[PDB]
Design an enzyme around this catalytic site. Sequence first.
Site, PDB file in Angstrom:
ATOM      1  CD  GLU A 246       3.180 -10.404   2.357  1.00 41.88           C
ATOM      2  OE1 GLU A 246       2.693  -9.074   3.293  1.00 41.88           O
ATOM      3  OE2 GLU A 246       3.810 -10.733   1.402  1.00 41.88           O
TER       4      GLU A 246
ATOM      5  CG  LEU B  87      -3.003  -7.897   4.137  1.00 43.30           C
ATOM      6  CD1 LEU B  87      -4.305  -7.109   3.386  1.00 43.30           C
ATOM      7  CD2 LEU B  87      -2.363  -6.580   4.750  1.00 43.30           C
TER       8      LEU B  87
HETATM    9  N1  NDP Z   1      -3.730  -9.974   0.341  1.00 42.05           N
HETATM   10  C1  NDP Z   1      -3.407  -9.017  -0.236  1.00 42.05           C
HETATM   11  O1  NDP Z   1      -2.246  -8.777  -0.452  1.00 42.05           O
HETATM   12  C2  NDP Z   1      -4.368  -7.740  -0.834  1.00 42.05           C
HETATM   13  C3  NDP Z   1      -5.491  -8.086   0.009  1.00 42.05           C
HETATM   14  N2  NDP Z   1      -6.293  -6.537  -0.077  1.00 42.05           N
HETATM   15  C4  NDP Z   1      -7.866  -6.774   0.567  1.00 42.05           C
HETATM   16  O2  NDP Z   1      -8.545  -6.846  -0.717  1.00 42.05           O
HETATM   17  C5  NDP Z   1      -9.896  -5.910  -0.096  1.00 42.05           C
HETATM   18  C6  NDP Z   1     -10.215  -5.194  -1.604  1.00 42.05           C
HETATM   19  O3  NDP Z   1     -10.661  -5.809  -2.430  1.00 42.05           O
HETATM   20  P1  NDP Z   1     -12.243  -5.024  -3.404  1.00 42.05           P
HETATM   21  O4  NDP Z   1     -12.626  -4.534  -2.332  1.00 42.05           O
HETATM   22  O5  NDP Z   1     -12.469  -5.325  -4.653  1.00 42.05           O
HETATM   23  O6  NDP Z   1     -11.308  -3.230  -3.434  1.00 42.05           O
HETATM   24  P2  NDP Z   1     -10.339  -2.239  -4.179  1.00 42.05           P
HETATM   25  O7  NDP Z   1      -9.548  -2.238  -3.705  1.00 42.05           O
HETATM   26  O8  NDP Z   1      -9.921  -2.855  -5.837  1.00 42.05           O
HETATM   27  O9  NDP Z   1     -11.129  -1.139  -4.629  1.00 42.05           O
HETATM   28  C7  NDP Z   1     -12.427  -1.087  -5.492  1.00 42.05           C
HETATM   29  C8  NDP Z   1     -12.727  -0.297  -5.918  1.00 42.05           C
HETATM   30  O10 NDP Z   1     -11.317   0.292  -6.813  1.00 42.05           O
HETATM   31  C9  NDP Z   1     -11.749   1.074  -8.427  1.00 42.05           C
HETATM   32  N3  NDP Z   1     -11.585  -0.099  -9.001  1.00 42.05           N
HETATM   33  C10 NDP Z   1     -10.865  -1.792  -8.331  1.00 42.05           C
HETATM   34  N4  NDP Z   1     -11.262  -2.067 -10.159  1.00 42.05           N
HETATM   35  C11 NDP Z   1     -11.442  -0.943 -10.987  1.00 42.05           C
HETATM   36  C12 NDP Z   1     -11.258  -0.742 -12.344  1.00 42.05           C
HETATM   37  N5  NDP Z   1     -10.946  -2.020 -13.578  1.00 42.05           N
HETATM   38  N6  NDP Z   1     -11.237   0.147 -12.875  1.00 42.05           N
HETATM   39  C13 NDP Z   1     -11.600   1.429 -12.457  1.00 42.05           C
HETATM   40  N7  NDP Z   1     -11.890   1.153 -11.291  1.00 42.05           N
HETATM   41  C14 NDP Z   1     -11.722   0.227 -10.034  1.00 42.05           C
HETATM   42  C15 NDP Z   1     -13.382   1.345  -7.742  1.00 42.05           C
HETATM   43  O11 NDP Z   1     -13.606   2.771  -6.591  1.00 42.05           O
HETATM   44  P3  NDP Z   1     -14.938   3.351  -7.421  1.00 42.05           P
HETATM   45  O12 NDP Z   1     -15.908   1.935  -6.379  1.00 42.05           O
HETATM   46  O13 NDP Z   1     -14.745   4.780  -6.308  1.00 42.05           O
HETATM   47  O14 NDP Z   1     -15.238   4.248  -8.598  1.00 42.05           O
HETATM   48  C16 NDP Z   1     -13.807   0.047  -7.061  1.00 42.05           C
HETATM   49  O15 NDP Z   1     -15.213   0.165  -6.572  1.00 42.05           O
HETATM   50  C17 NDP Z   1      -9.914  -5.806   1.288  1.00 42.05           C
HETATM   51  O16 NDP Z   1     -10.030  -6.819   1.658  1.00 42.05           O
HETATM   52  C18 NDP Z   1      -8.241  -5.441   1.666  1.00 42.05           C
HETATM   53  O17 NDP Z   1      -7.796  -5.678   2.804  1.00 42.05           O
HETATM   54  C19 NDP Z   1      -6.387  -6.016  -0.757  1.00 42.05           C
HETATM   55  C20 NDP Z   1      -4.992  -5.570  -1.216  1.00 42.05           C
HETATM   56  C21 NDP Z   1      -3.788  -6.514  -0.650  1.00 42.05           C
HETATM   57  C1  D2R Z   2      -6.220  -3.381   2.554  1.00 38.99           C
HETATM   58  O1  D2R Z   2      -5.778  -3.972   3.864  1.00 38.99           O
HETATM   59  C2  D2R Z   2      -4.360  -3.636   4.043  1.00 38.99           C
HETATM   60  C3  D2R Z   2      -4.026  -3.524   5.896  1.00 38.99           C
HETATM   61  C4  D2R Z   2      -2.938  -2.648   5.934  1.00 38.99           C
HETATM   62  C5  D2R Z   2      -2.060  -2.216   4.766  1.00 38.99           C
HETATM   63  C6  D2R Z   2      -0.276  -1.722   5.275  1.00 38.99           C
HETATM   64  C7  D2R Z   2       0.701  -1.772   5.414  1.00 38.99           C
HETATM   65  C8  D2R Z   2       1.957  -0.915   6.086  1.00 38.99           C
HETATM   66  C9  D2R Z   2       2.384  -0.972   5.024  1.00 38.99           C
HETATM   67  C10 D2R Z   2       3.816   0.422   4.897  1.00 38.99           C
HETATM   68  C11 D2R Z   2       4.415   0.624   3.381  1.00 38.99           C
HETATM   69  O2  D2R Z   2       4.709  -0.488   2.407  1.00 38.99           O
HETATM   70  O3  D2R Z   2       5.185   1.777   3.038  1.00 38.99           O
HETATM   71  C12 D2R Z   2      -1.956  -3.031   3.614  1.00 38.99           C
HETATM   72  C13 D2R Z   2      -1.026  -3.094   2.505  1.00 38.99           C
HETATM   73  C14 D2R Z   2      -0.683  -4.303   1.757  1.00 38.99           C
HETATM   74  C15 D2R Z   2       0.145  -5.127   3.053  1.00 38.99           C
HETATM   75  N1  D2R Z   2       0.842  -5.565   2.483  1.00 38.99           N
HETATM   76  C16 D2R Z   2       1.039  -6.649   1.291  1.00 38.99           C
HETATM   77  N2  D2R Z   2       1.222  -7.542   0.804  1.00 38.99           N
HETATM   78  C17 D2R Z   2       1.585  -7.938  -0.382  1.00 38.99           C
HETATM   79  N3  D2R Z   2       1.971  -8.842  -0.415  1.00 38.99           N
HETATM   80  N4  D2R Z   2       0.906  -7.358  -1.073  1.00 38.99           N
HETATM   81  C18 D2R Z   2       0.000  -6.177  -1.614  1.00 38.99           C
HETATM   82  N5  D2R Z   2      -0.562  -5.793  -1.780  1.00 38.99           N
HETATM   83  C19 D2R Z   2       0.563  -5.850   0.194  1.00 38.99           C
HETATM   84  C20 D2R Z   2      -0.800  -4.957   0.813  1.00 38.99           C
HETATM   85  C21 D2R Z   2      -1.533  -4.080  -0.052  1.00 38.99           C
HETATM   86  C22 D2R Z   2      -3.362  -3.412   2.974  1.00 38.99           C
END
Ligand code: NDP
Ligand code: D2R
Length: 194
Positions: free
Chosen positions: A28, A21
């Site tokens: 948050e 992130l």
């Molecule tokens: N702002 C927010 O709230 C959040 C932000 N993020 C950010 O998102 C990024 C990660 O996104 P992204 O790179 O797309 O990665 P994902 O976390 O979606 O992981 C991608 C991998 O997961 C598996 N996967 C995902 N979708 C499917 C599907 N439909 N079917 C089967 N396997 C699937 C595959 O794994 P395999 O390659 O093993 O088959 C794919 O290579 C980072 O920047 C992270 O920090 C993440 C969470 C929340």
């Molecule tokens: C991959 O880049 C990341 C780096 C660090 C963390 C972390 C942490 C501590 C959480 C502890 C708990 O929950 O017990 C996360 C998870 C995260 C955070 N905010 C989030 N905020 C929102 N609105 N949504 C999400 N989906 C979030 C998601 C997955 C993603």
Amino acid sequence: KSLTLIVALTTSYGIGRSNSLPWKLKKEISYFKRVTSFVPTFDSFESMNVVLMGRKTWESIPLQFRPLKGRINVVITRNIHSAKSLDHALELLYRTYGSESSVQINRIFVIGGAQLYKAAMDHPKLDRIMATIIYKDIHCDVFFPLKFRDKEWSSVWKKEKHSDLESWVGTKVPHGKINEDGFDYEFEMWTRDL
Ligand SMILES: NC(=O)C1=CN([C@@H]2O[C@H](COP(=O)(O)OP(=O)(O)OC[C@H]3O[C@@H](n4cnc5c(N)ncnc54)[C@H](OP(=O)(O)O)[C@@H]3O)[C@@H](O)[C@H]2O)C=CC1
Ligand SMILES: COc1ccc(C#CCCCC(=O)O)c(Cc2cnc3nc(N)nc(N)c3c2C)c1
């Protein structure tokens, strides 16, 4: 059962930068922990929420936080529970936490990343987005895949009243903009008809 997506994103749909992130927002993080780990009071002996995440997101979480405590964790990967798709995950869950199981399933959250988000928006059971809107154009290199807050999607996705949000997440949630460490950001809840 419906799926709910939860995400924090910028006004330009940025969610990520350098496998993490691009913000360090303590309040948050707590909302996220709280929404995903909240269960109707009467059910709370049996009931547990599920958090579904992509493998990349799984790997991004600091180790001290994996698995996410108090929630059933399932990592989606085409190759802690692992399943090969959202539907495989749902079949694993129902099978594993069947009425014969003592742990029961309350709400199922998709918690990222973009690729899993994209599959969840394609899923006919997904009807709710818990979106944290960050009012800054922070540089990001991973983006939320569908512009659900924009004009083009506004017949499908509707932003709900703040009190509807609080009714769902079951507590007072701040209204309006919260400032933390340089950011204004606001909690929203969007839904669509199934
Ligand atoms: N702002 C927010 O709230 C959040 C932000 N993020 C950010 O998102 C990024 C990660 O996104 P992204 O790179 O797309 O990665 P994902 O976390 O979606 O992981 C991608 C991998 O997961 C598996 N996967 C995902 N979708 C499917 C599907 N439909 N079917 C089967 N396997 C699937 C595959 O794994 P395999 O390659 O093993 O088959 C794919 O290579 C980072 O920047 C992270 O920090 C993440 C969470 C929340
Ligand atoms: C991959 O880049 C990341 C780096 C660090 C963390 C972390 C942490 C501590 C959480 C502890 C708990 O929950 O017990 C996360 C998870 C995260 C955070 N905010 C989030 N905020 C929102 N609105 N949504 C999400 N989906 C979030 C998601 C997955 C993603």
